[PDB]
Design a protein around this ligand. Structure first.
Ligand SMILES: *[C@@H]1O[C@H](CO)[C@@H](O[C@@H]2O[C@H](CO)[C@@H](O)[C@H](O)[C@H]2NC(C)=O)[C@H](O)[C@H]1NC(C)=O
Ligand SMILES: *[C@@H]1O[C@H](CO)[C@@H](O[C@@H]2O[C@H](CO)[C@@H](O)[C@H](O)[C@H]2NC(C)=O)[C@H](O)[C@H]1NC(C)=O
Ligand SMILES: [Ca+2]
Ligand SMILES: [Ca+2]
Ligand SMILES: [Ca+2]
Ligand SMILES: [Ca+2]
Ligand SMILES: [Ca+2]
Ligand SMILES: [Ca+2]
Ligand SMILES: [Ca+2]
Ligand SMILES: [Ca+2]
Ligand SMILES: [Ca+2]
Ligand SMILES: [Ca+2]
Ligand SMILES: [Ca+2]
Ligand SMILES: [Ca+2]
Ligand SMILES: [Ca+2]
Ligand SMILES: [Ca+2]
Ligand SMILES: [Ca+2]
Ligand SMILES: [Ca+2]
Ligand SMILES: [Ca+2]
Ligand SMILES: [Ca+2]
Ligand SMILES: [Ca+2]
Ligand SMILES: [Ca+2]
Ligand SMILES: [Ca+2]
Ligand SMILES: [Ca+2]
Ligand SMILES: [Ca+2]
Ligand SMILES: [Ca+2]
Ligand SMILES: [Ca+2]
Ligand SMILES: [Ca+2]
Lengths: 352, 352
């Protein structure tokens, strides 16, 4: 019942033009850190050595599951990086089957291993019976899809499974062969419903039966939800996807009664304005990022033991926050909408 | 939006007979690692240096919040340890006000900081209105209390608040002054209901109005729930609290449809047998301990992508597991009860 400690065995090496084919052959799943060359100062060297140690621990933990880790220097190994498609420094590229999955989240052994374990699972989860259907309906912090097919041999299910591989493990794909589940979901045979994160009502993919290409293109177009949750596994991907250099950031601790009350108002506002293409709200639950809470309180000058919502300038990390006297001074849906209007029409921005 | 890195400033020192009064005076909240003296070999020294570095990072993150960290050598500093009440090696003792809170969970900067942030919050959360009441009802993985009082100046509320301090932050204490909330909860004025983890029906504390002593003694007697969840913040406390050297361990991924279905059966069985004093089940959700999943799969010889339940021999880590062909071969409540009966009456044990 005790956490693993690094055993000193060198399992993570630099992946270069000489060895890369043998590395790909040695491992069923290969995760490659694409990194800039470390600077020569002692601090950057120490930081680089500590980064490699993180991969060594993950490689030890996942050795018996066919996972390997490597490192690609973006300058020294620029040619191999180009052939393999490694373009974003500090991203980890995970090779499973015919897909290349970009990891752009917290660089920690625990978060990396959890991600790899999700990668190793199958990309479609079946739903049969009432309890499994309830488990499906409880998912709201992720975009999700569900389709109804004849059986696992259906050409349309196989297209659906192939599409699921493209977005694995970020967007869970569900399938049912149970006409009673499908009827409850209002899914006609071979229809696919896309449930945007935190939305109650789905969007049916048009022109069924759907091909892999029709599903992929649909998901790409609905990928960005009106309300999306910051998660360690994807925090930098989410944070780097700003809209004109602005994030609306809502802090709410889901388990706290005041956070829940505010989060419920936020969800209701997102649902009523889900079609506004200029509206994108990031919900950060502070309990998921304890090491950042003091930094956020200092940088934004807010008390994160209470709900908050603001506009964040990503370049200078400048901000403006809705004025709430305390945790009990929460805005109504109408007040929150109007405040959002002000941020969108520019009435409320960091540059004033 | 970037994790803090240790800045090299020495904030964590050994706490000994010469300095301990000044350390206690320097910090509003003080967390002391009570540790055995490190061995002289290079590995134990490196491990000891890395452990101190964890505290340094936590101390940096929480410096502006009045938190300090120290280390007490159980041999060199045995006398100070005795005066301060430090008895369990590898535990962190947190001093807040008149209380001493034992931390016996994952030794990591993120988990430590999250715990300290919970310690710093007030020990009673108020409930007013329908949404806050819903937030209270959503809590099930913890024991919880809720009491109805006249107002914050009530002598009975103050006794309740004093009792909450004893168990902070492990057992959340809730209070309401709202007669409409209280009526919905069936709480008479100054009554306190204790909701055991995962139970639907509460137990009312007898002989109200209740004193601090009556509440504390009650909570101590109901502290161990029939079903309890392994959490990083308390994993070793929970794991060290075995019943005759045996844990019943249930693996279920709450978000997975098969895990949910099994977890729902487990909850139903726990509720129907909540008064069996010999029954204690530990639920481990694998998504909370990714770095341990491969180790558990190897040690117990089970596939943790599916639900599992077994009997664990803590000395030799030996085990026996309910035989489930796959994720869809889940037991009914009756089958699970009978299996539990077998483990309790000895019919199923690791020694066979
Ligand atoms: C976000 O912050 C950046 C940096 O503070 C802003 O950039 C400045 O914008 C003003 C007005 O356009 C210029 O006068 C400055 O010269 C800019 N400085 C730099 C370094 O570019 C940016 O305008 C802000 N954007 C939003 C949407 O708030
Ligand atoms: C749990 O495991 C320990 C260690 O394997 C068991 O201890 C052994 O018990 C048998 C039978 O009582 C003795 O013959 C051995 O000599 C014991 N060995 C040691 C080292 O003590 C223990 O009995 C097991 N307990 C349960 C409840 O399964
Ligand atoms: Ca190496
Ligand atoms: Ca493809
Ligand atoms: Ca990036
Ligand atoms: Ca962790
Ligand atoms: Ca439909
Ligand atoms: Ca078509
Ligand atoms: Ca990216
Ligand atoms: Ca609160
Ligand atoms: Ca409140
Ligand atoms: Ca939308
Ligand atoms: Ca917390
Ligand atoms: Ca957490
Ligand atoms: Ca409130
Ligand atoms: Ca030090
Ligand atoms: Ca006391
Ligand atoms: Ca211990
Ligand atoms: Ca973490
Ligand atoms: Ca009652
Ligand atoms: Ca009394
Ligand atoms: Ca303990
Ligand atoms: Ca499953
Ligand atoms: Ca299933
Ligand atoms: Ca019980
Ligand atoms: Ca997972
Ligand atoms: Ca997790
Ligand atoms: Ca099932």
């Amino acid at each position: 019942l005790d956490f693993p400690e690094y055993d000193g065995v060198d399992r993570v090496v630099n992946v270069n033009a000489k060895n890369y084919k043998n590395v790909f052959k040695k491992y069923e799943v290969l995760a490659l850190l694409y990194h800039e060359p470390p600077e020569d100062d002692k601090a950057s060297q120490r930081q680089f050595e500590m980064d490699e140690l993180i991969l060594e621990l993950a490689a030890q933990v996942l050795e018996d599951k066919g996972v390997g880790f490597g490192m690609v220097d973006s300058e020294k190994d620029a040619a191999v990086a180009k052939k393999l498609g490694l373009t974003e420094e500090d991203s980890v590229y995970v090779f499973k089957g015919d897909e290349v999955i970009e990891y752009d989240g917290e660089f920690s052994a625990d978060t990396l291993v959890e991600f790899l374990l999700d990668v190793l699972e199958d990309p479609v989860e079946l739903i049969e019976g009432e309890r499994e259907l309830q488990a499906f309906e409880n998912i709201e912090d992720d975009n999700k899809l569900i389709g109804y097919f004849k059986n696992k041999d259906s050409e349309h299910y196989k297209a659906y499974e192939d599409a699921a591989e493209e977005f694995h493990p970020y967007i869970p794909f569900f399938a049912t062969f149970d006409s009673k589940v499908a009827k409850k979901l209002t899914l006609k045979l071979n229809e696919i419903d896309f449930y945007e994160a935190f939305m109650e009502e789905p969007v049916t993919i048009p022109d069924k039966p759907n091909s892999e290409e029709e599903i992929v293109s649909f998901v790409e177009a609905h990928k960005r939800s009106t309300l999306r949750k910051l998660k360690p596994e994807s925090m930098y991907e989410t944070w780097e996807d700003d809209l004109d250099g602005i994030h609306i950031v809502a802090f709410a601790e889901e388990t706290d009664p005041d956070g829940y009350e505010f989060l419920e108002t936020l969800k209701a506002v997102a649902q009523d304005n889900t079609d506004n293409p200029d509206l994108s709200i990031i919900w950060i639950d502070p309990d998921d990022f304890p090491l950042l809470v003091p930094y956020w309180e200092k940088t934004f000058n807010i008390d994160l033991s209470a709900p908050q919502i603001g506009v964040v300038n990503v370049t200078d990390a400048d901000s403006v926050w809705m004025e709430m006297d305390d945790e009990e001074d929460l805005p109504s849906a109408e007040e929150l909408e109007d405040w959002l209007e002000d941020v969108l029409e520019g009435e409320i921005n960091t540059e004033d």
